[PDB]
Amino acid sequence: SLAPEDGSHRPAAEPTPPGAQPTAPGSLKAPDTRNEKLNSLEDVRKGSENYALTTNQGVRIADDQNSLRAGSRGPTLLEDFILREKITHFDHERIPERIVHARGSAAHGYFQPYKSLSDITKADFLSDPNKITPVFVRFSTVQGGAGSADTVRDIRGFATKFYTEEGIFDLVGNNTPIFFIQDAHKFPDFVHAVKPEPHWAIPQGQSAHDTFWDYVSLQPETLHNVMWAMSDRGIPRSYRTMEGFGCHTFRLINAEGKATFVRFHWKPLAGKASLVWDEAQKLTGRDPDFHRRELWEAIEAGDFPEYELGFQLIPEEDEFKFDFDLLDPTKLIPEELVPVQRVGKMVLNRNPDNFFAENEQAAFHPGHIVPGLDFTNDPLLQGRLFSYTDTQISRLGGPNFHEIPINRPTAPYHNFQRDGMHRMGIDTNPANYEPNSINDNWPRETPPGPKRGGFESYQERVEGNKVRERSPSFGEYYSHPRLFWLSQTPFEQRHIVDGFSFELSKVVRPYIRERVVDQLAHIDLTLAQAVAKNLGIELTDDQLNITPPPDVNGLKKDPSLSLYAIPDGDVKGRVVAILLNDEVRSADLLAILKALKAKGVHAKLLYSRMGEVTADDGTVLPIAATFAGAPSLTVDAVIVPAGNIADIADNGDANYYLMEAYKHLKPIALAGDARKFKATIKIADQGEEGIVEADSADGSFMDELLTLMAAHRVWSRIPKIDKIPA
Amino acid sequence: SLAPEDGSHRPAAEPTPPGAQPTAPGSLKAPDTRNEKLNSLEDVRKGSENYALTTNQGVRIADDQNSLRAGSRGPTLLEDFILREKITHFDHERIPERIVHARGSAAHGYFQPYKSLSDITKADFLSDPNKITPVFVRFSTVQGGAGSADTVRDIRGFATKFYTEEGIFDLVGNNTPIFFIQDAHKFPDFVHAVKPEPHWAIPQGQSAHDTFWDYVSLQPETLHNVMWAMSDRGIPRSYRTMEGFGCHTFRLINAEGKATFVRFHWKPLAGKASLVWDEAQKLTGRDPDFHRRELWEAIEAGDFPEYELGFQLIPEEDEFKFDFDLLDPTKLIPEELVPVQRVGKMVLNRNPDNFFAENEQAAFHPGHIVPGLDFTNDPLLQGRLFSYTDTQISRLGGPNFHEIPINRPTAPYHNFQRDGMHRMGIDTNPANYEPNSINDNWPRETPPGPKRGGFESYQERVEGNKVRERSPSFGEYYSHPRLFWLSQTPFEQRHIVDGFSFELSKVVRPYIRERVVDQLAHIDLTLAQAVAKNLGIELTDDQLNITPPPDVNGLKKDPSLSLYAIPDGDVKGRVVAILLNDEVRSADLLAILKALKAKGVHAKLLYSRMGEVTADDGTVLPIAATFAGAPSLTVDAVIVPAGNIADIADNGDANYYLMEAYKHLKPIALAGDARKFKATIKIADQGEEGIVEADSADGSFMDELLTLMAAHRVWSRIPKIDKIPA
């Protein structure tokens, strides 16, 4: 026995807050959580306790510490098959990563609709509020490799595999409502431009380089999604606090054969929240795994990520009722014009067991639809249809990638396809073709119908010549970027300006920055001048006189496009740093922790070293991390209780902890002599909004602090920060 | 036409300092840098100017902006073969990354010996000082994926492919002289322990997690390399400023067949330099591509990376003369006992053209030796010989990986091997077997000989039973850790303490931290106490009393193990940040740039925005980056010239710049009114060693600055930085 006698090696198999226990595989942490899909993976789950160590051929190994050699200082012999099997498996562990979205984090869960949608769709998973559908959801970035950082500025993917009783439906979305380009033929061009440059393979996880901004400057269709990426949307706080969108117009098809256009939405029930750029960037260094870690620890805590599925619905006969083409994936449909109708709730409640087997090998593809759904002619969606099947043949080693356990339908699947590399299923059908008599033609086709019917495409009318031609209706590039911009708060606009400004300062060829500034002046002059000023560029008289683009169907803003215009904060599962000292005042700490617990807010107790400290009244306080070990970047607010403040008053790290938190607009709360730290962030004796302070940590000290956390960040502090050296 | 009128899109084909030009593929940047290997790649280089855009089948494309569809808003057609070919190639771009050392950066160069080594080896590439051998070298980290960060704490790889006239010789080394483990059979155990943990795939690029420290605590053979990784060796400033080592005893064999034992060394002619932990970690967020960028830009500037190849030579009759085993790759050979003989110089002088084709597909393997070299029974080397061939079958797609251009020998190769996936060579030999009569037995075997002979193994005597058993002579784990510890300066010791303390604080299971502290107590009590103190652990009485391990063959230290004990600094190729103001004293900047140019030291002019500022005498000064866009992390020293200091005096970013540089021990120089900044870093009126200050940037000012830079960092500053909030 190598395990410690007290069993402190094994994580408690029960919900525990982040940091309290080591993390564990899902089926060990949460054995009582189940769903149909998790149940069906049991046949491939492999345990370990009380088993002998073997080869893959089931032969017990006696010595797993040494190779076979001719004498104990001799050459290794070719007959050591135990060595070669173990080294061969290791030698071939890696598979190609995804072309895009290589970096991502996944969890199991379930979905249920609020009511039957049988009036608008015959999709079985939406037919009955008691029907529960297991899901597997992978969130991701786009540009960087599987080993790149989480808190980059980038679009995020949000892909949901629904294991329905009528097939797999994959909803393969992103965290913005549009894309950079219109036609799929340009996808390798765009992706090449944003990816690391081909001579030197720099930069990782970043659009802040020449080729990306060259492409944007030469393809104004990209401006709409670029505005989103340059906004704080590009740097979410958590996968739990971002929106999801299906990107395209799809169709719902009802039992009667009626088609309704649909765009898919995910609403985060934890609310919308993003980092700020300095924070996000430093965080890629302090913890490049932050969002992966946060997702996993949320689920281990019982802070289950929850999302409401919603549909924007447009009748067929309303196809041309807008200023923009519904099929144009660079156009959003404003919620002011077409409301999101709520459809159901998805809850992610179990982590995987093995990240490679379940997460890296999962394959999601938007052509995986089910009867009651269908496509449209969106020419980006159209080409996606080819890519997501094709790419699996190298990534997952061939055409049996549906037999990889995570990818298996829970619905029955039977057909006449055979063979391929890694073939698992052993077909007993005397026939591998149809029509056949020798098995009475089974498995048999099934006519379309209201439920459990075969898939038939909606008989959309097609008329025109075979052309490689962009629709004239897609030839408008500025009005949606402008609607987005005008829908942002003044501080969200500031962050957009600083996004473009920082990124363009990393473009080495000046003309490319000038070209991009010219594009911005076709969107909004204020935006354009503000970026220009940061780049030392002066707008020409002609640029000053560019007529703004028209509003979008009469709208001059839509507040649903703003992260923050309409409060939707939720403090459950946020985290607070508590800065300890060698003699904490216990009455302050009890009050703090009691208030945080009651709202589901976590805490981490920090000090200048590991171990424990002791409060005035003798309570032993265990330390979670050092100031340097768990920086303010990783938390939502900072509280400093009273006591022996002198112990940390000249600690560089403790001071800088409050400076970095202050700079990043986080709430800060100071009790009694911890008010001494006001000097380091230059707060006046009268105090300021966003800094909570009092003689002791209650009456209303915690309610104040928690009100501030509900509003996420202290935007009014923005003017004060530039003067702090942090 | 899309390029600018003024031609500023194309970088000058002449050496230019970092940031002065956009970087470019090596054959365009330096078309006249040639060697036999670079020339031999010409058959596969493909240009682009003035060529028509085509399919892979040579069909010209008219419209590369659109898919073929039925009507300009209609569905995409399956007959669009131009779209599918383009998307197919994209969908299959990725190949598996290396199992280890997936993150790496590579360059072309050449090697040439200082004299003939025919007395000790018949290796042709070492036979004459006139023999120029092309090389391709790849530097790497170990743990993180291909998209992980450069300045992590890790071991680094240093792999050199020598294209000799008698075959490829790959010297596949690392930046420390030993490894973590003794026997290859345990490599997958160690690597899985260090890699992201299997449930959740965290952490990336870090050993700072439970499983690594669990293994280390259970496997004391690891402790020697762990000491190296926890030192500043684990965070090099640059691939140019680290040592390299062949890791194992090999043999040289001469024309008379005498075997000499050899360990290989690469000595950086730019000297030894590393970062400090906070700076490295933060750098992984500010520029995860820092080392890749710095290598590429050094070569573009003419700061070619230079290394001297060195041999420690031990006669065969001396095999048992040391108190460690020569075959134990966890043991180093102290240079005080066996000096390094300087044998030749390697210069890296050209970057690749396409990173994926030349860097990512390069295959190095230490079994690739030539006549004149041979192996030993080192049980780690022994198992390596199996792995580096086997792993390429999946990584590079089959057994013809030597036909991928970068991998091809420049020496002739002919044999009877045929077929395999993507077979390039078309064999005309009527025979595919030997012995054969139908081709008069060609190609024919060659007897071993003094030159151009076939390979024959050294006839080492082997005597012993077939056993899986570790040699008893390997069973000593603490004396080399202790020699390394005692050979470091007191500041290098402090950083080792900090590295253990920081990593162990990130281990969630406390008993693992305790067990590692017990191992430290077997190495050195002072080390063990300092780490324990940072972890709130108290040494027991037994631990205070463990007898230290013996000295190594009478040695109680060897200064060659220190990065810094013996001065070795070279300033050529280093970079200074110069913080501008809106009216710089031009006379300061003339002198600063003058003196920096004379020592080959580069500069970046930094300000609060991009564009230009104008000096007092009207000189226009282009701005390279903002203070926040190019942080002090990225420079070796900071200079603030006189002028309008009021402009920047209250810039938080400008103040922080100097705080961060100060905290990281970098030389700072301040002229005239720049001395106002002393107050932000708490410098007494009387000054401080490591802060250069004068009325103006005269001649003595720059000499003192350049002196500090030759010594790398200001170690005497360490006790002052604890109080600085940065």
Ligand code: HDE
């Ligand atoms: C709307 C949300 C969205 C959009 C518009 C696109 N992606 Fe995605 N993508 C693949 C190809 C592809 C194409 C051809 C287009 C437009 C033509 C898009 N993308 C835009 C892919 C290369 O086939 C892909 C990589 C590996 C794979 O299996 O599919 C792919 C990835 C991807 C993901 C990741 C899925 C996961 O495993 O987590 C997501 C969420 C998207 N795309 C969304 C998406």
Ligand code: HDD
């Ligand atoms: C028995 C397994 C094994 C063992 C014990 C070692 N290696 Fe290794 N090494 C591999 C198996 C391997 C590998 C899995 O085969 C890699 C990764 C993929 C590749 O092409 O080779 C590799 C890559 C690799 C590289 C990168 C080559 C490149 O840049 O493409 C370096 C520098 C080293 N190794 C160096 C070392 C050192 C210095 C070791 C100890 C002294 C060592 N290896 C032990």
Ligand SMILES: [S]
């Ligand atoms: S999209």
Ligand SMILES: [S]
């Ligand atoms: S080694």
